[model samples]
Target: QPWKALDAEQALYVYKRCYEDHLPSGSDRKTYMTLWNAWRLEPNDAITHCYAKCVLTGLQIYDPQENAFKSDRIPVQYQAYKTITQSKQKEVTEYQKALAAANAKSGSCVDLYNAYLPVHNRFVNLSRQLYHGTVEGAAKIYAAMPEIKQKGESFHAYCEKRAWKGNKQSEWKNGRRYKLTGSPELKDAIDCIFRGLRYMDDTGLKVDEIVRDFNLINKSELEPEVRSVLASCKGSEAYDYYVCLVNSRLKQHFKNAFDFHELRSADYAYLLRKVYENPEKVKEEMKKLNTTVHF
Candidate 1:
């Protein structure tokens, strides 16, 4: 039979039985149990749990603390409603208070995602132009950076704000780039850069973006063989290989820039070693170094 229209109880029993047989292991279990427990509590619990997880996950709410999807939490909050449960208005009042705090801290998912793109690109270009692709050099630049005026606002803050425009994407014009708020890889990039911005403010090292951007750009260059290997490699092994690849590419870019002087002696030595490992490959990139200049 197709089971075209199974009743709610039958559906719940089937899902619960399947989940019991195939309960996930490790951190995934936390969410699994959360949903499982919700279902265990009642059918409505299962219903709400599905909706809440759907809405919150779509909003990219990592926790009560950090989220980016900007919309009313009423959908999530409504999931808390249960007719058989008592407490009338009291439960709702408390949930509302909780929602407010969560929203205030996390901001809207749409807003955060929208705000990030322009800010990320603008800062990247500026850092490349100003510090010339060296974290230490950027640090030095920021140290002497006197607050100037831009668009009748503090240049530093103004640039930051303008770049951080928080409007949601209304169109799919640029393809999947605008659609990936919930992607684990994309989340890593966002969190890494957010942390790095403060580091830039304090140390001007731009350490965060160098690593984050390096991985993002090169993720596409991964060979089919490499991707297959990574799929099979467990956890840290895959991560380490990915990082090594990013560092290798970052070094290539750093060497091509005239501001390569901003890099430390060790960085140069590392690149030199890479060149020694493959002379002809490095030579082509080295040829372009002479053409890259400031002003």
Candidate 2:
């Protein structure tokens, strides 16, 4: 039903949706081969290009904030994104050096250009899309890309929806039987990242398991902040431990676009939960993260 009516552009939207939801999912490697092979089948289909990008995305694993996934799968042409981060660090060093030269005075020349920020900040990134178009140039090649500028953004959105859906459901189900524990906010926060990653096609594990593990992690790391969650009737002695146990097995649920099926109940369950819950925690968490969804 979802794929039947989709035209090329609309199908690209589906590709993006799947990319966002499943790239890092368990079957990403297979998905990549599937899409790559599809290109061989119908090279002109925008959908196939969309799928290639999704596969390539799964190969990427760096987290910008923690600097987690900085490996070779990242394309050299995209090095600028990484460079910008390195530039931020360089800006800091230069600022400090200038300050040292200035006897650590209130400020110095470097502060004018590098201290506050070397480049202005932007909420939306249009450069990647612009360059992709510029490099393509030809009418036929350009035609395949979606009209919207940034190709990867939808992955973030779709994943966010899924992560939150599972988180709240797990909370409601577990919370019904047991009280929640400290930093109940953590579940919401972590869920946001997981969902965002889900959009990228990383489905190595189930959302429920992720939430479960986060609950356990919170118990050990954030007990002081999350005592309120423990007040629920469903809170059991093994609640935290059990969730942690569930988390251990969540290691392989993600896959790239190739992993999706038509109207699977579990997928719909994940999607609709996000749709129904207003004021969900994922929105707030998204604002705080300054990274892309790789896994």
Candidate 3:
């Protein structure tokens, strides 16, 4: 029959013990499901190991000390339920306390986001600076940089935030007259800004339209063969080539979280060298794919 026909109090006791056991031990799916169920019935109770399991799965929770997302507020022992009409501040206080006890620690999400704020702020500022730059803006920013990073690059994403918004200098030469740099490092660093902004666009949130504006794939004139190869390459190779190119640029501009950057300028150069080495041959390949051949 029923294991013990537990009363609510005894059931709660078992639930708290389960958390204690799992907090010291690792988790099993079944154990977590049990813990989650108990917490759901008694959300006001002290948090438990099961709450941590939820955090790992990306569930959102209220935190107080670090203002972090963790299982810190749940309680192990039953207390009289606060009325639904409790003041917001009072509820927040209780939640913070319970969440801390659940996590077996004392920190809130505020502290957590604070820790990461500087890195993101740096990246955002760098992006804004780039967005406001000239066509040769990337070079100017590079000149101002204090130092090269670990990979001889910087994390400053430099690009026109809203496209080259007619910021043409009085020194205006037409597009054909604009001086393109032979600095491969500059090219990679600049391209990383474009790629990063494009990713932000893909999120489909506020949809920054600037990234879609007439951005060239690279300084390399569009080789018909690279187009053909891009069309034919399956999965990662097709996406990877571009992604790698972006990564290489980011690595060159290595600003923060070095592991976040992968690929080197050489890696991007190799992919280009492999794919577009024979422009004429690639043109023929493109024709075979029925692509309208263009320079």
lDDT of each: 0.31, 0.30, 0.29
After TM-score superposition, the amount by which residue 119's alpha carbon in candidate 2 deviates from its true location, in angstroms, is 45
Q: What TM-score should be assigned to candidate 2?
A: 0.19
lDDT of 3 by residue, 177-257 (tens): 112342343344335433432332233211122221112223233233334433343443212333342344332221211
For 1-295, candidate 1 gives per-residue lDDT tens digits of: 2112212222222333334334444566456556444333222333333433333343333233344332234223223222212223444444334444433334443433233323323333321222122334333333444331111121122223333344642222231122333434433433332332222233333333334332333433434433443334343322233343334433343232212221111122223112132323333433333211121
Model 2: per-residue lDDT, tens digit, 195-281? 333311233334343233333223234332222333331423233422442333321221111122111112322331132222123
Clashes of 3: 30
Q: Candidate 2 regions off by >4 Å?
A: 1-181, 199-289, 292-295
Model 1 misplaced regions, further than 4 Å? 1-65, 68-224, 234-295
- Assess the local accuracy of residue 230 in candidate 3 as a C-alpha lDDT between 0 and 100: 34
Give the Cα error of residue 43 in candidate 2, in Å: 8.9
Best by lDDT: 1
Order of the predicted models by TM-score, top scorer first: 2, 3, 1
- Clashes per prediction? 8, 52, 30
